[PDB]
Amino acid sequence: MSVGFIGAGQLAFALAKGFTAAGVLAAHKIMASSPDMDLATVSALRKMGVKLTPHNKETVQHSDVLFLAVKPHIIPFILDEIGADIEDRHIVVSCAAGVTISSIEKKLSAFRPAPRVIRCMTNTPVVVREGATVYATGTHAQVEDGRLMEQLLSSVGFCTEVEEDLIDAVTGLSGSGPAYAFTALDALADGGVKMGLPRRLAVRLGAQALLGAAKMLLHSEQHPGQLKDNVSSPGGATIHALHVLESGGFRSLLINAVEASCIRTRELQSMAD
Amino acid sequence: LYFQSMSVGFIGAGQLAFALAKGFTAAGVLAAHKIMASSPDMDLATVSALRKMGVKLTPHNKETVQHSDVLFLAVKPHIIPFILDEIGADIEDRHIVVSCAAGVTISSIEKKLSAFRPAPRVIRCMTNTPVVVREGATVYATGTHAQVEDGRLMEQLLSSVGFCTEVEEDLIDAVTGLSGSGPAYAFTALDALADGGVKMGLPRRLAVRLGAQALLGAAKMLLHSEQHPGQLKDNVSSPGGATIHALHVLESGGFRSLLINAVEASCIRTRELQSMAD
Amino acid sequence: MSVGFIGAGQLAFALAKGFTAAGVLAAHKIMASSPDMDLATVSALRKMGVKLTPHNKETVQHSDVLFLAVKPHIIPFILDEIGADIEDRHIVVSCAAGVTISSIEKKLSAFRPAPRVIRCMTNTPVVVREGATVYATGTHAQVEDGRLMEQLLSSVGFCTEVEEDLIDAVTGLSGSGPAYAFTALDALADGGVKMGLPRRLAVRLGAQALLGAAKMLLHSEQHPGQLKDNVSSPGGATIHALHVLESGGFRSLLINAVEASCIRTRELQSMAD
Amino acid sequence: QSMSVGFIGAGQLAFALAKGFTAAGVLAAHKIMASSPDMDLATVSALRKMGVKLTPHNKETVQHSDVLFLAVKPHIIPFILDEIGADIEDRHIVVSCAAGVTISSIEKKLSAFRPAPRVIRCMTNTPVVVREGATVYATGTHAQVEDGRLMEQLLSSVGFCTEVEEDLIDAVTGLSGSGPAYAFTALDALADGGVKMGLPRRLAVRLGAQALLGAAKMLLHSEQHPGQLKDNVSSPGGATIHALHVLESGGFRSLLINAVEASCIRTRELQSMAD
Amino acid sequence: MSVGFIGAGQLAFALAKGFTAAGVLAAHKIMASSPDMDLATVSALRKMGVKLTPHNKETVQHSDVLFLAVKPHIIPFILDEIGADIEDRHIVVSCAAGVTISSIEKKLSAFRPAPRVIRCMTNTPVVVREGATVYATGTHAQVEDGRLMEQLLSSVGFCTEVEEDLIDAVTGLSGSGPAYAFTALDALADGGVKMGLPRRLAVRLGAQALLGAAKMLLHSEQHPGQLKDNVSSPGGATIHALHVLESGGFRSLLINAVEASCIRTRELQSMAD
- Which conformational region is residue B254 in: left (phi greater than 0), alpha (psi within -120 to 50 degrees), or beta? left
| Interacting residues of A142 by C-beta distance below 8 A, sequence separation 6+ | A116
Q: Measured between alpha carbons, how far is A105 from A91 in angstroms, rounded to an integer?
A: 12
Helix orientation angle between A177-194 and A199-219, rounded to the nearest 10 degrees: 130
Question: Nearest to residue B180, comparing CAs of E119, E170, C192?
Answer: C192
Sign of CA dihedral C84, C90, C94, C99: positive
Question: Beta strands E3-6 and E30-33: pairing type?
Answer: parallel
Q: Measured between alpha carbons, how far is C257 from B247 in angstroms, rounded to an integer?
A: 7
Q: A85: how many CB neighbours lie within 10 A of its CB?
A: 16
Q: Measured between alpha carbons, how far is A45 from A8 in angstroms, rounded to an integer?
A: 9
Cβ contact B160:B127 at 8 Å: no
Q: Measured between alpha carbons, how far is E86 from E56 in angstroms, rounded to an integer?
A: 12
SS3 content of chain C, % helix, strand, coil (to 5): 60, 15, 30
Dihedral angle computed from the Cα positions of residues A108, A113, A116 and A121, in that order, rounded to the nearest 10 degrees:
40
| Residue-wise burial string across E87-97, b where 16 or more C-beta atoms lie within 10 A, e elsewhere | eeebbbbbbbb
Question: Nearest to residue B101, comparing CAs of B197, B162, B173, B152?
Answer: B173
Gapped junctions in chain C, after residues (C–N > 2.5 Å): none
Q: What are residue C3's phi and psi, to 5 degrees?
A: -125, 135
Identity (one letter) of the amino acid at D164?
A: V
Residue A233 DSSP one-character state: P
Cβ contact A125:A152 at 8 Å: no
Q: Measured between alpha carbons, how far is E18 from E8 in angstroms, rounded to an integer?
A: 14
Size (chain B), residues: 278
Question: Nearest to residue B157, comparing CAs of B107, B184, B123?
Answer: B123
Size (chain A), residues: 273
Question: Beta strands D53-55 and C30-33: pairing type?
Answer: unpaired
Q: Measured between alpha carbons, how far is A13 from A177 in angstroms, rounded to an integer?
A: 19
Q: In what order do the strands lie in the sheet with B35-38?
A: B56-58, B35-38, B8-11, B70-73, B96-99, B121-126, B136-142, B162-166
Q: Do chains A and D touch (3 or more CB pairs under 8 A)?
A: no
Nearest CA in chain D to E231: D181
Distances (CA, A) of E130 to D275, E11, E22, E65: 47, 14, 11, 21
Q: What are residue E33's phi and psi, to 5 degrees?
A: -130, 140
Q: Measured between alpha carbons, how far is A13 from A36 in angstroms, rounded to an integer?
A: 14
Interchain pair D227, B191: CB under 8 A:
yes
Q: Is A230 annotated as a binding residue?
A: yes
Distances (CA, A) of C60 to B53, C1, C5: 56, 13, 9
Interchain pair A190, B251: CB under 8 A:
yes
Helices (H) and strands (E) in chain C, counts: 12, 8
| Interacting residues of E134 by C-beta distance below 8 A, sequence separation 6+ | D207, E120, E121, E159, E160, E161, E162, E166, E167, E170, E174
Question: Beta strands B121-126 and B136-142: pairing type?
Answer: antiparallel
Q: E74: how many CB neighbours lie within 10 A of its CB?
A: 16
Cβ contact C227:B232 at 8 Å: no
Residue C249 DSSP one-character state: T
Question: Nearest to residue B37, comparing CAs of B5, B6, B60, B69?
Answer: B60
Q: Any chain B CB within 8 A of the CB of D229?
A: no
Cβ contact A58:A79 at 8 Å: no
Distance (Å) from the alpha carbon of B256 to chain C's nearest alpha carbon: 5
Interchain pair D236, B204: CB under 8 A:
yes
Most distant CA pair in chain E: distance in Å? 68
Interchain pair B193, C249: CB under 8 A:
no
Question: Beta strands B162-166 and C157-161: pairing type?
Answer: unpaired
CB-count burial class (<10 Å; 0-12, 13-18, 19+) for C35: middle
Interchain pair B273, C237: CB under 8 A:
yes
CB-count burial class (<10 Å; 0-12, 13-18, 19+) for D247: buried
Element containing residue E212 per DSSP (H, E): helix E199-219
| Interacting residues of A144 by C-beta distance below 8 A, sequence separation 6+ | none
| Interacting residues of E108 by C-beta distance below 8 A, sequence separation 6+ | E79, E83, E86, E92, E115, E117
Cβ contact A63:A31 at 8 Å: yes
Interchain pair D251, C246: CB under 8 A:
yes
Nearest CA in chain C to D231: C223
Q: Measured between alpha carbons, how far is B35 from B6 in angstroms, rounded to an integer?
A: 9
Q: Any chain B CB within 8 A of the CB of C12?
A: no
Q: DSSP H helical segments within C220-249, as ranges?
A: 224-231, 237-247
Helix orientation angle between D179-196 and E250-267, rounded to the nearest 10 degrees: 40
Dihedral angle computed from the Cα positions of residues B178, B184, B185 and B188, in that order, rounded to the nearest 10 degrees:
180
Q: Measured between alpha carbons, how far is D249 from E177 in angstroms, rounded to an integer?
A: 17
Cβ contact D120:D151 at 8 Å: yes
Residue E84 DSSP one-character state: G
Question: Nearest to residue E184, comparing CAs of E192, E215, E121?
Answer: E192
Experimentally, the structure was elucidated by X-ray
Helices (H) and strands (E) in chain A, counts: 12, 8
**DSSP per-residue letters across C95-121:** -STT--HHHHHHHHTTTSS--EEEEEE
Question: Nearest to residue C126, comparing CAs of C6, C14, C12, C9?
Answer: C14
Interchain pair B239, A187: CB under 8 A:
no
Cβ contact E255:D192 at 8 Å: yes
Q: Measured between alpha carbons, how far is E102 from E113 in angstroms, rounded to an integer?
A: 13
Q: What are residue B99's phi and psi, to 5 degrees?
A: -90, 130
Q: Measured between alpha carbons, how far is A148 from A127 in angstroms, rounded to an integer?
A: 20
Sign of CA dihedral D228, D234, D235, D241: negative
Element containing residue E14 per DSSP (H, E): helix E10-22
- Determine the 3-state secondary structure of A187 from DSSP: helix
Half-sphere exposure of A106 (CA within 13 A, CB side): 9
Interchain pair D234, B200: CB under 8 A:
no
A52 DSSP β-pair partners: A32
Chain B residues with CB inside 8 Å of C263's CB?
A: 245
| Interacting residues of A175 by C-beta distance below 8 A, sequence separation 6+ | A97, A121, A122, A123, A261
The CB-based long-range contact list for D108-115 (8 Å cut-off, 24+ gap) reads: D109/D78, D109/D81, D109/D82, D109/D85, D110/D81, D110/D85, D112/D85, D113/D85, D113/D86, D113/D88, D114/D85, D114/D88, D114/D89, D114/D90
> For every residue of B163-216, which 3-state class applies, written as one string?
EEEECCHHHHHHHHHHHHCHHHHHHHHHHHHHHHHHHCCCCHHHHHHHHHHHHH
Q: Measured between alpha carbons, how far is B216 from B182 in angstroms, rounded to an integer?
A: 14
Report the residue from B234, B247, B248 with minimal CB separation from A199: B234
Q: Measured between alpha carbons, how far is D19 from A24 in angstroms, rounded to an integer?
A: 93
| Interacting residues of E226 by C-beta distance below 8 A, sequence separation 6+ | none
Q: Measured between alpha carbons, how far is E5 from E65 in angstroms, rounded to an integer?
A: 9
Identity (one letter) of the amino acid at D241?
A: I
Q: B275: how many CB neighbours lie within 10 A of its CB?
A: 9
Q: What are residue E159's phi and psi, to 5 degrees?
A: -150, 135
Identity (one letter) of the amino acid at E146?
A: G
Cβ contact B105:B77 at 8 Å: no
- Determine the 3-state secondary structure of B14 from DSSP: coil
Q: What are residue C214's phi and psi, to 5 degrees?
A: -60, -45
Q: Measured between alpha carbons, how far is C73 from C82 in angstroms, rounded to an integer?
A: 16
Chain B residues with CB inside 8 Å of C154's CB?
A: none
Q: E102: how many CB neighbours lie within 10 A of its CB?
A: 16
- Determine the 3-state secondary structure of C224 from DSSP: helix
Q: Measured between alpha carbons, how far is D79 from D73 in angstroms, rounded to an integer?
A: 11
Q: Is A249 annotated as a binding residue?
A: no
Q: Measured between alpha carbons, how far is A226 from D37 in angstroms, rounded to an integer?
A: 75
Q: What are residue E131's phi and psi, to 5 degrees?
A: -75, 170
Sign of CA dihedral A101, A102, A105, A107: negative
A33 DSSP β-pair partners: A6, A53
Q: Any chain D CB within 8 A of the CB of B79?
A: no
Q: Measured between alpha carbons, how far is C15 from C127 in angstroms, rounded to an integer?
A: 6
Distance (Å) from the alpha carbon of D227 to chain B's nearest alpha carbon: 9
Q: Any chain B CB within 8 A of the CB of D244?
A: yes
Distance (Å) from the alpha carbon of E265 to chain D's nearest alpha carbon: 6
Cβ contact C157:C125 at 8 Å: yes
SS3 content of chain E, % helix, strand, coil (to 5): 55, 15, 30
Helix orientation angle between D252-272 and C237-247, rounded to the nearest 10 degrees: 130
Element containing residue C30 per DSSP (H, E): strand C30-33
Distance (Å) from the alpha carbon of C199 to chain D's nearest alpha carbon: 31
- Determine the 3-state secondary structure of D159 from DSSP: strand
Q: B81: how many CB neighbours lie within 10 A of its CB?
A: 14
Cβ contact C224:B208 at 8 Å: yes
Cβ contact C194:D196 at 8 Å: no
Q: Measured between alpha carbons, how far is A135 from A149 in angstroms, rounded to an integer?
A: 8
Interchain pair B247, C259: CB under 8 A:
no
Cβ contact E206:E192 at 8 Å: yes
Q: Measured between alpha carbons, how far is A48 from A29 in angstroms, rounded to an integer?
A: 11
E255 DSSP β-pair partners: none
Q: Measured between alpha carbons, how far is D6 from D52 in angstroms, rounded to an integer?
A: 10
Q: A148: how many CB neighbours lie within 10 A of its CB?
A: 17
Q: Any chain D CB within 8 A of the CB of C247?
A: yes
Size (chain C), residues: 273
Residue A232 DSSP one-character state: P
| Residue-wise burial string across B179-194, b where 16 or more C-beta atoms lie within 10 A, e elsewhere | bbbbbbbbbbbbbbbb
Distances (CA, A) of D114 to B153, D68, D90: 60, 16, 8
Question: Beta strands B35-38 and B8-11: pairing type?
Answer: parallel
Interchain pair D253, C251: CB under 8 A:
yes
Distances (CA, A) of D144 to C160, D124, D151, D155: 63, 21, 11, 17
Q: Give residues 108 to 147 of D whose Cβ lies within 8 Å of E.
A: 125-130, 132-134, 136
Nearest CA in chain D to B188: D227
Nearest CA in chain B to D240: B199
| Cited resolution, angstroms | 1.6
Q: Measured between alpha carbons, how far is C68 from C82 in angstroms, rounded to an integer?
A: 11
Question: Nearest to residue D229, comparing CAs of E9, C223, B45, B184?
Answer: C223
Helix orientation angle between A199-219 and A224-231, rounded to the nearest 10 degrees: 130
Interchain pair C224, B171: CB under 8 A:
no
| Interacting residues of D243 by C-beta distance below 8 A, sequence separation 6+ | E172, E176, E179, E180, E256, E257, E258, E260, E261, E264
Distances (CA, A) of C35 to C49, C53, C54, C78: 19, 9, 6, 11
Q: What are residue D46's phi and psi, to 5 degrees?
A: -70, -40
Sign of CA dihedral D217, D221, D225, D230: negative
Distances (CA, A) of A57 to A5, A51, A76, A95, C10: 11, 14, 15, 19, 50
Size (chain D), residues: 275
Report the residue from B234, B237, B240 with minimal CB separation from A195: B240
Question: Nearest to residue B122, comparing CAs of B136, B104, B135?
Answer: B104
Question: Nearest to residue B54, comparing CAs of B25, B74, B19, B11?
Answer: B25
Report the residue from B230, B234, B248 with minimal CB separation from A194: B248
**DSSP per-residue letters across E240-271:** HHHHHHHHTTHHHHHHHHHHHHHHHHHHT--S
Q: Measured between alpha carbons, how far is B222 from B228 in angstroms, rounded to an integer?
A: 8
Q: Measured between alpha carbons, how far is B62 from B90 in angstroms, rounded to an integer?
A: 7
Distances (CA, A) of B175 to B111, B141, B152, C205, D257: 24, 12, 20, 8, 25
Q: Measured between alpha carbons, how far is D62 from E137 in angstroms, rounded to an integer?
A: 62
